[PDB]
Amino acid sequence: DGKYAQKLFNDLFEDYSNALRPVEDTDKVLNVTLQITLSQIKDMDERNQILTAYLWIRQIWHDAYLTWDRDQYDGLDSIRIPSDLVWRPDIVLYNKADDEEPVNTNVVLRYDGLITWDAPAITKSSCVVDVTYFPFDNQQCNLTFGSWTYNGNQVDIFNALDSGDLSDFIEDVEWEVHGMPAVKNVISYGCCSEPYPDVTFTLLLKRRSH
């Protein structure tokens, strides 16, 4: 019980740096599976071609230093932790049209080192009009996510699902969501550069019929 949750926490973080990429061997990669949930479309700005969206970003990865033997902690297999206590993969929206308050979040850390991190985000990003495809009143909005600092040999990002999660979407008045397919892009510069991955969600909006 709570008795042991304190013991485990103390034992886990007695020698733990949230600035060190949590791999045993430094040339091992750290894999991250990313999932985007579209909560709602806050504002689709046609004049400035900017989409403002509410999203939930779910990130999953393994921390090689945050493991424990369950039988040594009264069978405790999971604990909630403020996300800022653990190393975090540093993934941001690349196509931020926004020029610029941070929010406290909690991860769930499992006995085998698996960390799940749900965190909300309010993104602003450019869109391109499409008038060629039916119904010829379309907005294509790309959300591209990737690491701010790490290359793909250090942190590699993978899509959790074929597309964003639209099961909890709030219908917009003027815009219908036609899909949110996701893809992964890995970019290498010149002959020999190390890989640079990102995952891109393509929000396809068609103007609502009324």
Partner: peptide
């Protein structure tokens, strides 16, 4: 290009 990529960038310098 590499030099307009924050993951690369400080490496063209």
């Amino acid at each position: 290009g590499c030099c307009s990529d924050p993951r690369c960038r400080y490496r063209c310098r």
